[PDB]
Paper text:
Overall, QDE-1 exists as a compact, but flexible, dimeric enzyme with metal binding sites confirming positions of the catalytic sites but with extensive additional structure whose biological functions are less immediately clear.
The structure of QDE-1 ΔN was initially solved by multiwavelength anomalous diffraction (MAD) analysis of a crystal of selenomethionated protein, expressed in yeast, to a resolution of 3.2 Å. The structure was then refined against a higher resolution dataset extending to 2.3 Å. These crystals belong to space group P21, and the crystallographic asymmetric unit contains two subunits, which together form a compact pyramidal object with dimensions of 90 × 70 × 127 Å3. Analysis of electron density maps showed a Mg2+ ion coordinated by these aspartic acid side chains (the functional significance of this is underscored by the observation that the QDE-1 polymerase activity is dependent on divalent cations).
Numbering used by the authors:
A (entry chain A): 390 to 589, 604 to 627, 641 to 1240, 1252 to 1270, 1282 to 1372
B (entry chain B): 390 to 590, 607 to 626, 641 to 1240, 1252 to 1270, 1282 to 1372
The structure:
Amino acid sequence: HAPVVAARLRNIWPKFPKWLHEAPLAVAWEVTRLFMHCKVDLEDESLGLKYDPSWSTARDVTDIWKTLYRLDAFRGKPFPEKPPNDVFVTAMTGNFESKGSAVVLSAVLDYNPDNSPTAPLYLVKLKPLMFEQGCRLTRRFGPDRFFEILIPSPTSTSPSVPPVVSKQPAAVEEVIQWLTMGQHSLVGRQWRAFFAKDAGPKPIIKERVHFFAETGITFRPDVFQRTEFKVSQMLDWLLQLDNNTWQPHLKLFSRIQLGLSKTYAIMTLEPHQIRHHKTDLLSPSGTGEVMNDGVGRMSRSVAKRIRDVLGLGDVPSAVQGRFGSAKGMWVIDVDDTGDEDWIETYPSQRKWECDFVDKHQRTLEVRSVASELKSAGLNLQLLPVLEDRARDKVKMRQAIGDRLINDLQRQFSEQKHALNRPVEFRQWVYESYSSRATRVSHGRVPFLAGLPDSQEETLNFLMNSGFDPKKQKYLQDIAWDLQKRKCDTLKSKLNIRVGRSAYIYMIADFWGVLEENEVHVGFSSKFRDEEESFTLLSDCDVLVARSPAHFPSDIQRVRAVFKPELHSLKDVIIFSTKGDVPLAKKLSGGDYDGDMAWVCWDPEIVDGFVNAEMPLEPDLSRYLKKDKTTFKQLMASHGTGSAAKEQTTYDMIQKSFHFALQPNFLGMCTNYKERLCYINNSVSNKPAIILSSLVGNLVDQSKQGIVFNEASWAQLRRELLGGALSLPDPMYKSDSWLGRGEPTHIIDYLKFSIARPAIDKELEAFHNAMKAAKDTEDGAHFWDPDLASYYTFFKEISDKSRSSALLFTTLKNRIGEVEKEYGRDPYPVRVNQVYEKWCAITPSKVIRLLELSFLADREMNTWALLRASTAFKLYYHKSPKFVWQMAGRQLAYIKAQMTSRPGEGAPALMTAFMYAGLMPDKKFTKQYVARLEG
Amino acid sequence: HAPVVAARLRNIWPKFPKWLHEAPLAVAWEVTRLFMHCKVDLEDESLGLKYDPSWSTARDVTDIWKTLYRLDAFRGKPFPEKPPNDVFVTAMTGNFESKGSAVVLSAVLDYNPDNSPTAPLYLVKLKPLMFEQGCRLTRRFGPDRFFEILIPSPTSTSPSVPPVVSKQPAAVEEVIQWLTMGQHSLVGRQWRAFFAKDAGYIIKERVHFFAETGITFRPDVQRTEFKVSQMLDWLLQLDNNTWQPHLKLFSRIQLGLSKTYAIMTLEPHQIRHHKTDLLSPSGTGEVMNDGVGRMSRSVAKRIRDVLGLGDVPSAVQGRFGSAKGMWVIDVDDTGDEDWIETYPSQRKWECDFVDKHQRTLEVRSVASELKSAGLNLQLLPVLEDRARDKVKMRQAIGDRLINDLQRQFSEQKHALNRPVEFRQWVYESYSSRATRVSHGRVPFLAGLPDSQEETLNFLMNSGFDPKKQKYLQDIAWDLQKRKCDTLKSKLNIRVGRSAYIYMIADFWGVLEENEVHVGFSSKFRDEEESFTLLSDCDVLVARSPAHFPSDIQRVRAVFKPELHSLKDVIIFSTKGDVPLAKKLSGGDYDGDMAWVCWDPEIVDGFVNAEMPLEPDLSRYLKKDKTTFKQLMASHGTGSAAKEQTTYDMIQKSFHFALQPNFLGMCTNYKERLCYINNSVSNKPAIILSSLVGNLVDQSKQGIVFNEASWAQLRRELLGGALSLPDPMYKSDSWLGRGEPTHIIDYLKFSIARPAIDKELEAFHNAMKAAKDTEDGAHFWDPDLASYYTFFKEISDKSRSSALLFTTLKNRIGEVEKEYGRDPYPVRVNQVYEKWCAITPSKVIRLLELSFLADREMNTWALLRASTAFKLYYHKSPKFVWQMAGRQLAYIKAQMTSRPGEGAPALMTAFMYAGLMPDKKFTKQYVARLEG
Ligand SMILES: [Mg+2]
Ligand SMILES: [Mg+2]
């Protein structure tokens, strides 16, 4: 209770008018969206609202917007963005649920740029209805009963946050109280907060908050759509609270995320089909150490059901999932020769005490599956530890630079060779980037004005109509904008490719075949590395790591040993359950609940590496303070019985929100450590070991109830290190070397001595080159006489003209006006505005032939061809980007028309849909070129 | 000798003029491939000879005949097949070799339809110059010194053979004598015969000649005179191999002719000749690695390098000096030195390995990624013979087949319901990639692709729907009907978990006797399941064909981590009494592939039989073991004696190679008798299996087996005499008394046929769908009359465009009538040409767009297409689609376009040809469509 805030925090939500009370939920949502967007008051008695019965039977939101919009006070604009039909229909008529998909209600709040109280404080924008995979909780209670927002973090220091908040210490407590203390009215439902978490110049970080529709004007009581139901009951259903009062309440709150986890429901197992183990697999040496933390077995038939319901090409050996209170990985049991369904759970997987009685507690839900692997490369954060652990550091660093030079050289040579033939460049462009998901989503290649959205898609669209990247400069320009952007990425990220490396799910050996420093890695298919291929790993040393590696010991060198017993387990890496300490825990305190290891079998990288033992970590208890307060201790303030328990549940939500919304120091302490280790050039001295241990403890902050605030951070740097004082940014944060003399630090050296010269050298190759193209014949020009085809045709006519003539003059004039418009807000919207003026350039008997009005799509007429070519003749000069962006599409048609030859096959006019479904045939390319080359 | 036949063959070959002794060998070819076709001769007179040149410096062909025909001349329908430029260039300027390819001189002889005696007997046609992979012999002596012909076999037997030869018994000796006794003049060279064998593909035999001299050669002891006897002595180092049976020695000549890639020449210190093979550990003395040896890892990387393979191959089939067989990477090789070994069982003659060409590794083939083999019908009788429960075996195979049949019929019918899906199915139903590669586009006949399948996709890609447009519906139907025929004629048992795999022997002592190791180079996919290797299961292995009950064996797949690096080969134990390979129809490790099957249903019921007690067939099978040394005894000693002995061996061995092949005949008899007996394990079956097994090695075993022997065998051990009928399953229908009882009969006629016929009833019930079910699919499409209606509207206030439109309709009508009225593609073209001939101030300039080099991209072509459609969709649907399909598709794609719903794409013919349907798009897109 500040109050300052309030009154601000009014009144934050859009009102729900009486004329709109006959819903339905989806209409209410999407109509409210048109009103907020157009800036139209929903409690306006000047507009004569109303309620279109027709909206009730609507299957396209555009129908409940063209209403409307109409009215005159809606124009505007167009948009909102608009929910897809299939989504809208599901929300309207399919229960907010389409197979596995939930319809999602979401909003983003940004600080009100306004001011004074009684202005809101937050502006709310409602997202369009959308599909996202469901979760336990939306399958149990209905997707329509869940609402999520992104909201500016109230403890965000700083400086672009309103004064009103935080120069008024605690009302951080007022914001949370607003969030949690009562219900929020939105679109005729009563929403109550039950979860908060971090989100999925310098902006204010937002936190994601989840609300449950406890009631609304359509619900009904109760005990004993759609029935009233409290958040305390919902969470009791999820967590079986009666049996979990012993738990620290912050930790218990953190388990709510397991009901929100986006997962595929696979199958419900019978009780007799479930094996709950009372004990984990423990260290053989008596350390009491858990050797299979987060991992269990499943039967083979269970894994086949997962292939089945998910539609996988193959039975997966392991999956990341949930099952009642159990969370982690399940791996097929290699000893299963039966065909009966079963699964097991271990104490380390079970996050609360669950009776596993209702079918939703006994349903296997899949988050992700072990899939075919792809090369990982080397991230620059691994480098300092790799260098630290090198038997010889000068050679390590010479080698890593050579590798980066070579890989770069290698990717340039392949690009420039492929460029020499359209079939080959198309194949290279296709392989460089996946567009299939975009294509599946739109039922076509999406266009911005006259060309595809995507640069890659633009290249192939144009080459498929006969343009040549070595002949047309525009194709050339894009081809190298692309190679530039990729150089930028390499110097920023230093993602040096290492062909023999992959991220692989870690699994523990239940079967007792791997000795302590042995790992088993078999692949589901051929893993290719330039000249060499692998279906498995055997008799070689490998490096394993989890990202991020901080301690010198966070990367380990071990022996890859293929065990025939584990032959069936593919695309996972199995660690021994022998020894004192599981290998997983040595890899940055990891485990087997979904962790993936960086696995590297590259000889040059593996062979110079020397293992370090675990660090003696410091006691940080003075700075890191765990709140261990249990649900039982919170309930003692209210007493005993159902009302006591209900209020305790809400206490837990409120205290845990107050915890979740505190600043994240993980990021801050990680950056300090980056900076400190950089200046010291050491990842193994005492300060380095202290900070690595620090950030290691902050990773589990949320479920450990670790309190760590600003005063404690300062105290810890004061007492154990620095340099309150900002440490300078590493030099490698800048684009050019701003250091003194030669780079000494390995990242500076790799970015500045190696990558930057090599890039600029590789770019001096084809600017050279440009330049070498006047008329060697080759080279690459903007001009193409083929595309002035219709121009010259109608100028001849035009001559000759009378008055075609006049038509042709207006045309050139209008194009000129629109190029001027192109010369002068987000980018795609502005381009569209110009595209629309472009399309508005419109024309007995000559106009009828140019117009072909029997075609519903204007942009397929002969006029569009003429307009495109005239614009080309006039502007290929001059404004090359203007012409291609507006008319790319018809330039392509003209090109395919013009290059066609009698008796040399037929050009194909493909529908947008049918075109999106084809891919380059790599065998064709390869075989066709092979015959071209004798 | 033999009175006639001579001189009824002493010209045969041109006929090599004054006068063209000059100008490169290629030029000559090639020119003497013109008196050949078409005519002229020797021999003149008229009209002008010798020189051009270029000719004597050309780079085409092509040309040359462009000198030609002065002449005038012929004028003989200017068409010889014609050698490719790069080939001709190589033969002209590149030594007949580039770099791995040899230029090949070949001809085909057919019997002279003429007669009597002074006429040739053979007509010879010279093939155009061509590239083929070289061999040891062309690399050593030059591809230009070798000439090969196909020649009718003088011992066939019969009917369509000239009189002329047999019934003049033993002029078969006269033909061979002609072939071998002396030199043959051809294009200015003197060719001598040194090898004969059966053809690569009245049966003809392939004969090989070597240019011993010619009017460009030079004395000794381009280039130099050299005898066939010297060339063979270089190859086989005859001095040290006189101990060999001369037929077997002759057989080894094939090793010099084997088409191989030269990889690298190893130094002497890098070669390891073992004096002994790996022998049975039981003391049987059996060779356990027959035909196989190890190579170092660096050698195998050199093979990947020079062959441009994507990976190091674990094993290769090759030659190396006298050694023939497989070489496998030594898994124990941790060095990087080049080495190879040879074994007695690999070495086919005593070789010093001195010459670089005796020490060059030559690759015939390499172990490559595997694909599914399925089950060959020939294996079924033995699978059934060895079934623990034959009733259950037969039932599973039929169930397997019924299910496959119903699956593939239901999949076509389902795919039909969505154009993305039907396009995918159509694409997967037949491969068009090679046609597309060859043409640089999809070939069209008139207005539509050549191919029905390509037509379906072309039309669907512009927006037509096979459930809506009857034209597409009729084609799809036609394809299934057509597929049904093929199924009835081609019984197919489908088995995903099987492959043919190169057999290799375990040099490393890790596999127990009934264990095999199989690792794959990549994922071997079978519908629901994938394998990168085989472990902990039983597998069946066999070599095709399997004859004896024991020719298929069930063994244990055990993955040995020591052998993990060996991929796409199967490794057999070198323990036990007898090598597994030998049990697989007398096989070995020199290139044999095993049928490997790990399908549980097929493996499970199988019970191993032991090796059969084979009968003594000495009386019928007669081995001539006469050695080269015994042949040489009739001439004496020294170089002259040796030379004539070599020619002796060619003559004698030609006489042996040209005798009828009974392997085929005895194999057919066995199939027919075992079918009648419904037994592959009774006494006549064992006798016939043992017979054909002995006939496989006939050539290098010098086994003589003629008609008298075959008839005596049949008489004594069998058998009619008497022609066995064909098995019922060689006829298309069952005819056939009652129910099929033979397993193949049962599967074909009792299982497959009733399923196929139940499916020809499904389609025919849907033919009568039909009337006006509103679906129905129709020929009518108002989209396709687009331009028609547009121009009738303009022609209404005509005045003028009316007249233009009236001529158009008229001329289309004339061409429709022409379509109503040789071969097929030629006639269609004629009509297409008249159709394209239908051609048109400002309106005609807009319709014509003459700046377009391709007429058929005109707005007029669109107008012509739709007015033809409007006027004829009803009456002559095939006419309009055949002529105008192309533009009907353009119209459809234009019409069907909607603003803000994406852009149609005008693809070039070439760029369209290089795209395939994306299976993942199909699959993901429909998944989204279905909620
Ligand atoms: Mg974990
Ligand atoms: Mg063999």
